[PDB]
């Protein structure tokens, strides 16, 4: 009884996974509160904790880093849900506390942990309405190192004329990421502006959830992983791309829907972007 979420569907990862790419030997790092790394649905290869309360990296406290690790790579097996890229290796890089909140030094250590440790994807579904020149300088460390770096927008919808993209998504080298529902239309509270890149799945998203359950979330946080989890895919078949080419290839590639102050470039296609 496994169910495979729409979003999955929708980005078209299950053509790559039945020509038997699964985003094998990719390592991914999913920095957020944490994995439920006792879930029957996930399995966790390794991580830090850079929370000085909560020094477990495999205790989400929270729920939300167990959420954003299943729409990555909750197992193909015969329970649960189905990932995007169901065999890359998952590492919790705890850098949120149980109330959702972390501070940005704790981010940023993470982020450099990332870099050390090879991680080809970093993860990020959180971001702040400031910057600092320490929080850029680890995202294009990163990028300069060949991670690719994906960030969720924000759930700030329209003010105006203005961005309402949070950071670090709206950095020129992270990618950022909007929420569109199953009929393709941007979901309300998604942020905008210039700094759109890719939309992706963020309505009603079903993944793991700590202690052996599954639930429904909604938000930009829930779109950022469909495209990590793309970029695991895609490394899976071209491993010899740089992280250069699979942004390339992820932005030139998805399906145009209105303006791009709302849509980015429009929907992820991971089939035609994986060639
Ligand atoms: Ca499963
Ligand atoms: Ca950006």
């Not at 790394?37 to 929270?62: I, Y």
């Not at 015969?78 to 998952?90: C, E, F, K, N």
């Not at 890089?93 to 981010?107: H, M, N, P, T």
């Not at 052996?212 to 078949?237: D, E, Q």
Request: aromatic share 6%.
């Amino acid at each position: 009884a496994q169910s495979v979420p729409y979003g999955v569907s929708q980005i078209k990862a299950p053509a790559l996974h039945s020509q038997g790419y699964t985003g094998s030997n990719v390592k991914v790092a999913v920095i957020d509160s944490g994995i439920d790394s006792s879930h029957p649905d996930l399995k966790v290869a390794g991580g830090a904790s850079f929370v000085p309360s909560e020094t477990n990296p495999f205790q989400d406290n929270n729920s939300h880093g167990t959420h954003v690790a299943g729409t990555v790579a909750a197992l193909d097996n015969s329970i649960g849900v189905l990932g995007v890229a169901p065999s890359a290796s998952l590492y919790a890089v705890k850098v949120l506390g149980a109330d959702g909140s972390g501070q940005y030094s704790w981010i940023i250590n993470g982020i450099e942990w990332a870099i050390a440790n090879n991680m080809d994807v970093i993860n990020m579904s959180l971001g702040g309405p400031s910057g600092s020149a320490a929080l850029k300088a680890a995202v294009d460390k990163a990028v300069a190192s060949g991670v690719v770096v994906v960030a969720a927008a924000g759930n700030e919808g329209t003010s105006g004329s203005s961005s309402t993209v949070g950071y670090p998504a709206k950095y020129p080298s992270v990618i950022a990421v909007g929420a569109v529902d199953s009929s393709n239309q941007r979901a309300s509270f998604s942020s905008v502006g210039p700094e759109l890149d890719v939309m992706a799945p963020g309505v009603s998203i079903c993944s793991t959830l700590p202690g052996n359950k599954y639930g429904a979330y909604s938000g930009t946080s829930m779109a950022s992983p469909h495209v990590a989890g793309a970029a695991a895919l895609i490394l899976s078949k071209h491993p010899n791309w740089t992280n250069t080419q699979v942004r390339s290839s992820l932005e030139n590639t998805t399906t145009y829907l209105g303006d791009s102050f709302y849509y980015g470039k429009g929907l992820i296609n991971v089939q035609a972007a994986a060639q």
